[PDB]
């Protein structure tokens, strides 16, 4: 009995958890990519030139099947997040857009 209202409400709660988590964390001493929410997952502060990881967000309907997965994103050398984001580990195990369109 999954509705749009429930999924959106769970996403909003995840977003709120990310805000509070980032607000409580002390920012680091030196250069680092800023902790941020990218509409999908919460990113902690990351070291420059390091690959950040974030657990698959719990609001996903299929979260139990990807609980041990991680989203990946690179922190640039100058302390700016890269644009690339890999959430393949967090995809629905039954993903297939061609048959969904069918």
């Amino acid at each position, epitope marked *: 009995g999954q509705t*749009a*209202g429930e999924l*959106y409400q769970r996403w909003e709660r995840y977003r709120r958890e990310c805000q509070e988590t980032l607000a409580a964390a002390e920012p680091p001493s030196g250069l680092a990519c800023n902790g941020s929410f990218d509409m999908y997952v919460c990113w902690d502060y990351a070291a420059p030139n390091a690959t950040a990881r974030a657990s698959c967000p719990w609001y996903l309907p299929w979260h139990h099947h990807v609980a041990a997965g991680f989203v990946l994103r690179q922190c640039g050398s100058d302390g700016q997040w890269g644009l690339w984001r890999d*959430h393949t580990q967090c995809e629905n195990p039954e993903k297939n857009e061609a048959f969904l369109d069918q």
Partner: antibody
Amino acid sequence: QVQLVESGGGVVQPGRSLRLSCAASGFTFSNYGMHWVRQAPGEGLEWVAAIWFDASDKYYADAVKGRFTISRDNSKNTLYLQMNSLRAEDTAVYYCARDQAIFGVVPDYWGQGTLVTVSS
Amino acid sequence: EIVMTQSPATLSVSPGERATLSCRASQSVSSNLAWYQQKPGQAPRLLIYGAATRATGIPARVSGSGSGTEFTLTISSLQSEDFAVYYCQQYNNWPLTFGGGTKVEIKR
């Protein structure tokens, strides 16, 4: 800031197909769901379709079930609407709209629309 | 589909007066309801979501209330830009649906 511009509108014969596109700028396209909404001349807003930020799922209005297909190319910052078996009552301005989140629940910023005329 | 019905179809209000618009859902949509404004020749405009939360840039004179099946949009003092068509929309479940619209015209 947010800019959505629709393209591909025009005249199509009844029963034929047409595809609209929407180019996004001023925000990170891959972080948001998207919507299509249409408005017949002199009429109200009618939701058409929506799509996840990563196309995980797609949703359609009853009026277009089995005929329309929404999709997106994040590398080109473009949203698409493939329309098949068009009928005269599909004539409308078609709006591209960004979702407030990543699923397609609330269109929070809208484009200007493109007119689609289904006629012989 | 969840049927959204707005009343009245046309609301006649004097400038500076309060406009009170009604939206009804055919079944409970909790607080998963949004309101939009549209001027002729212009794209729609998000005003309220969550039945009562104003979008960014929306003045305090616009307020939304309600939950379940009955909602209200209120603009306490209409300015020139406030005369337009207003739509409600539920996102409790897909397919998303808009109300038929309520036109707010200048009374004379």
